[PDB]
Design a protein around this ligand. Structure first.
Ligand SMILES: *[C@](=O)([C]([C]C1=[C][C]=[C][C]=[C]1)[N]C([C])=O)C(F)(F)F
Ligand SMILES: *[C@](=O)([C]([C]C1=[C][C]=[C][C]=[C]1)[N]C([C])=O)C(F)(F)F
Lengths: 10, 95, 131, 131, 95, 10
């Protein structure tokens, strides 16, 4: 849980 | 109403300083964030408020309410999942 | 969200769209698992409502989104509609969400977790970008 | 309601109480018939919610009220949660309401009915009597 | 929150003069009433707004929204049943 | 419809 396969780039 | 998914970072505030804005409306199951030049808005409700904990995004808030005009200078109000998680756990287990 | 920025398509995988039979985006959700959605009580979701997973562009036709049905609405029996306190509802899917690169779960805090004022987190949605 | 007056017990017979499993009054309804309740979309009613007919004193123990169940929530597919437009939901009862001296139906207007500004009507509820 | 059922009479207003108060929030499926020294309030929602027509109380409004502080000087907003009745009729007939 | 068995006294 909570570890995207594709990272948010803030 | 954007076709495109939006994102925003914002500081989490204390109830005390939050009550500063919303008075006796801020209850125990609510956590404030924003008033930072950004704000959640109509249609955002029910969505996530996430904080990264130990390498992972955790559900800490649920966009609930705030400013009628989604003012960027007033803190949006969110459901506090932590006071609700017990309820959620209990709910999954039974169903 | 007002003053946000467009997110990276599928970078926020538990983020779902609550849509009525009309296709209208009315609320958001968070996939806590493949069988459950977390949203706000006040959103007044019904079993006639639909759960949209792995969408990014509400107006894109070439998106491999998952339109999942709602078997039951489990509303926090401690929701106060007078004050919007304990503003949380659970959603129990008829058809399990297929987790993927773009469809996955959020973590939940321990009732024991601490989250300090001043801490910068992230909100996401298709809420009005303007008032 | 603020600045209202207490009504005559059962003088407003289509007036119902929307209560959660907790007994908490969260919204109102209007009996349009023995099988259907009219309320507001935004009230977020679920099938876990209960319909209370012929009550007057939410705190009275000697009231012959009818606690009717909700089979389905039919939400106006044109409800705009962003603007609270077409704020109406229908309720389909599992168990038909027993009409009586105190439990009866409201009339509906013809889409053709006129209702002039300046006209004095009546609102009823168990909403906060004070802010 | 009263154990006792409340009642109140109030004037029905026009959107035009209502927009005077609520601006571009007042849409076609909404009808205003109040601003008369009385107001609907939190918990009143979904309940009836009734006008007597030809000897009978007719459902003309559904307490929807208004003032955050249920101000008696501002008009409460109600769903306009008349723009919805067709939908309601259609809904009963099928079910 | 809309004719109470018991009259509202406004
Ligand atoms: C919800 O999106 C909104 C969210 C919101 C509005 C205004 C300021 C901050 C957040 N909430 C309400 C309560 O108006 C939804 F309810 F519209 F759906
Ligand atoms: C509803 O009772 C209320 C009703 C109301 C509140 C404030 C002024 C006028 C009417 N509505 C909202 C939208 O706060 C309920 F939603 F609380 F349940």
């Amino acid at each position: 849980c909570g570890v995207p396969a594709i990272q948010p780039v803030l | 109403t954007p076709d495109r998914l939006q994102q925003a970072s914002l500081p989490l505030l204390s109830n005390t300083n939050c009550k500063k804005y919303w008075g006796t409306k801020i209850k125990d199951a609510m956590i404030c964030a924003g008033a930072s030049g950004v704000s959640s808005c109509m249609g955002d409700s029910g969505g996530p408020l996430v904080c990264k904990k130990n390498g992972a995004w955790t559900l800490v808030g649920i966009v609930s309410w705030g400013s009628s005009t989604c003012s960027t200078s007033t803190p949006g109000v969110y459901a506090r999942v932590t006071a609700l998680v017990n309820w959620v756990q209990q709910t999954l287990a039974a169903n | 969200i007002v003053n946000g920025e467009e997110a990276v398509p599928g970078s926020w995988p538990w983020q779902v769209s609550l849509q009525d039979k009309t296709g209208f985006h009315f609320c958001g959700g968070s996939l806590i698992n493949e069988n459950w959605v977390v949203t706000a009580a006040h959103c007044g979701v019904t079993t006639s409502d639909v759960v949209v997973a792995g969408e990014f562009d509400q107006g894109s036709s070439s998106e491999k989104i998952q339109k999942l049905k709602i078997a039951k609405v489990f509303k926090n029996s401690k929701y106060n509609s007078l004050t919007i306190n304990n503003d949380i509802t659970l959603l129990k899917l008829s058809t399990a969400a297929s987790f993927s690169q773009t469809v996955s779960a959020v973590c939940l805090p321990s009732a024991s977790d601490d989250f300090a004022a001043g801490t910068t987190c992230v909100t996401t949605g298709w809420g009005l970008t303007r008032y």
